[PDB]
């Protein structure tokens, strides 16, 4: 309601801002004119300075690039050749190493896997009997536990009857007057709050 | 009142739970004993068979492992020799490359750096002139910037004071009845808060 009075001061604030938006911004533009003029005194020389330097720079760089490229060509080629022969020697080494070791590894695998074929096979079979006996134990006690659980579930359901019936009715018998009392407190609160929030 | 009866049902449940857990832990343990006894008997054969068989298992594996290690060491010697002799050539030939190609690198680096010296020296010197021009403009423009900024700041301070006092006093003057009316509503609303929760 009184916001009009407060906002009126905001309008005055806008006016004060507009006063600055004029000469201050205009002055800023005048400063910008100095900035642009300055840049036209800096960049004018800078750009030419760059051009007059980039040319010999790229030229000197080209010289260095040439030195590097030529030098590298006279290095990469012979080195690659030597590395190739060295790699071929390494390859031959690898071949002459991985071949006997490969055959050996295959026999190693034979001696290991065939061993496993005669180690894990009876092991799994033994485990099968062991697991079977264990399964029977789990089924014996499990089947019993199922009966026990069913009995306990029955006891639990029976002990739940005294909760889902009398206790639930008791809760309902409590909820009725409670909700009523809550309603009285809520209704009054609604009116009371509305009266002060109007 | 509600909590008293509700919690009563809780204790009337904990008791039943305790009366249930009693035989439950026993029945569970009885079944657990049957299982664990069987597991023990089973584990007796399990561990014994595993240990009795682990002996020839390890013996078989170690036997082959001996061959694996022996043949490995047997071949490791000539293989290491191939690596050593081969590397001797590879490294020696490379050392014979790092020498001339290294000298060439240094010689190329000489021209590389020396050409850089004859370029970077005047480049940085001329850059000093460029930077001088930049700094000159930055100083001259800066002097204006600061002068204008001071002017703009003064203009800002003028409108600032026109708001820090008149507008602020308007706000503060309004804050008086506003805060008071708010206090009136808050203090009165506080009645409901207490008369509804106690």
């Amino acid at each position: 309601l009184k916001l009009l009075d407060n906002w009126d001061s905001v309008t005055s604030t806008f006016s004060k801002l507009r006063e600055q938006l004029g000469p201050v911004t205009q002055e800023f533009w005048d400063n910008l004119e100095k900035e642009t003029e300055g840049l036209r005194q800096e960049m004018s020389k800078d750009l030419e300075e760059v051009k007059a330097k980039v040319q010999p720079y790229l030229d000197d760089f080209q010289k260095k690039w040439q030195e590097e490229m030529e030098l590298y060509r006279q290095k990469v080629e012979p080195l690659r050749a030597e590395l190739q022969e060295g790699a071929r020697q390494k390859l031959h080494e690898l071949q002459e190493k991985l071949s006997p070791l490969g055959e050996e590894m295959r026999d190693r695998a034979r001696a290991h896997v065939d061993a496993l074929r005669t180690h894990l096979a009876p092991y799994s079979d033994e485990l099968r009997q062991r697991l079977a006996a264990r399964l029977e134990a789990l089924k014996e006690n499990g089947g019993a536990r199922l009966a026990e659980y069913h009995a306990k579930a029955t006891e639990h359901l029976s002990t739940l009857s005294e909760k889902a019936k009398p206790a639930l009715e008791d809760l309902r018998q409590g909820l009725l007057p409670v909700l009523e009392s809550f309603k009285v407190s809520f209704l009054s609160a609604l009116e009371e709050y509305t009266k002060k929030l109007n | 009142l509600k909590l008293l009866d509700n919690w009563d049902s809780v204790t009337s449940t904990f008791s039943k739970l305790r009366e249930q857990l009693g035989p439950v832990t026993q029945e569970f343990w009885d079944n657990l004993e049957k299982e664990t006894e069987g597991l023990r008997q089973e584990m007796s054969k399990d561990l014994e068979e595993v240990k009795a068989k682990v002996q020839p298992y390890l013996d078989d594996f170690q036997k082959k492992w001996q061959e694996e290690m022996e043949l490995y060491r047997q071949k490791v010697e000539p293989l290491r020799a191939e690596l050593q002799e081969g590397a001797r050539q590879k490294l020696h030939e490379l050392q014979e490359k790092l020498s001339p190609l290294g000298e060439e690198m240094r010689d190329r680096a000489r021209a590389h750096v020396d050409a850089l010296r004859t370029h970077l020296a005047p480049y940085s010197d001329e850059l000093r002139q460029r930077l001088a021009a930049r700094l000159e403009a930055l100083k001259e423009n800066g002097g204006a910037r600061l002068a204008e900024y001071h002017a703009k700041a003064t203009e800002h301070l003028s409108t600032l004071s026109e708001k820090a006092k008149p507008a602020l006093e308007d706000l503060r003057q309004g804050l008086l009845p506003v805060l008071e009316s708010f206090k009136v509503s808050f203090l009165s609303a506080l009645e409901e808060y207490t008369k509804k929760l106690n």
């Binding site: - | 664990t36 597991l39 023990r40 584990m43």
Partner: protein, 185 residues
């Protein structure tokens, strides 16, 4: 790659630093080393098995520090080093036993009684008296001398064997036998 933590406790003057340094770089000290918290780690072959031993040599003049209590818990085996020429040390052995019992939260902890300076002419603690005390605790007694290097390594070897003994026993005690498992530990 098996590393064991050995803590050497004792009164100031017994020469804990000397004992440890003698095993590490094999050099006898001559100055009063103001040891507070210094560890020494070396690797040796004990009974055919390679073991890394990290010996913690701490101050023997601390009252009751929380930092001490904490680092005492990280020690597996404990060496009760006392001087055969110092009656106070023989009586203070019980203090070490109780301190370790509390920090380890167990009464059955591998410990070894070490009687250093047995080469010295001065002897107030007889071998039987010390051995009897050790026997009462259920631990072995080793007479040592850092000056003559006698029993030095032996004491350490014994401690490692006690640690092994305890761990082996617990592993072959009764896992499938259901001997104290619980759920909240």
């Amino acid at each position: 790659m098996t590393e064991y933590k050995l803590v050497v406790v004792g009164a100031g003057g017994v020469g804990k630093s000397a004992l440890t340094i003698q095993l590490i770089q094999n050099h006898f000290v001559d100055e009063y080393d103001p040891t507070i918290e210094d560890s020494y780690r070396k690797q040796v072959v004990i009974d055919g098995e390679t073991c890394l031993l990290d010996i913690l040599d701490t101050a023997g003049q601390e009252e009751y520090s929380a930092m001490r209590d904490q680092y005492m818990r990280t020690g597996e085996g404990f060496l009760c080093v006392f001087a055969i020429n110092n009656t106070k040390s023989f009586e203070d052995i019980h203090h070490y036993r109780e301190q370790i019992k509390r920090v380890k939260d167990s009464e059955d902890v591998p410990m070894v009684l070490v009687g250093n300076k047995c080469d010295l002419p001065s002897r107030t603690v007889d071998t039987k008296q010390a051995q009897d005390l050790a026997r009462s605790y259920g631990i072995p007694f080793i007479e040592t001398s850092a000056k003559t290097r006698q029993g030095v390594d032996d004491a350490f070897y014994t401690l490692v064997r006690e640690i092994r003994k305890h761990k082996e026993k617990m592993s072959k005690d009764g896992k499938k036998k259901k001997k104290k498992s619980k759920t909240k530990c």
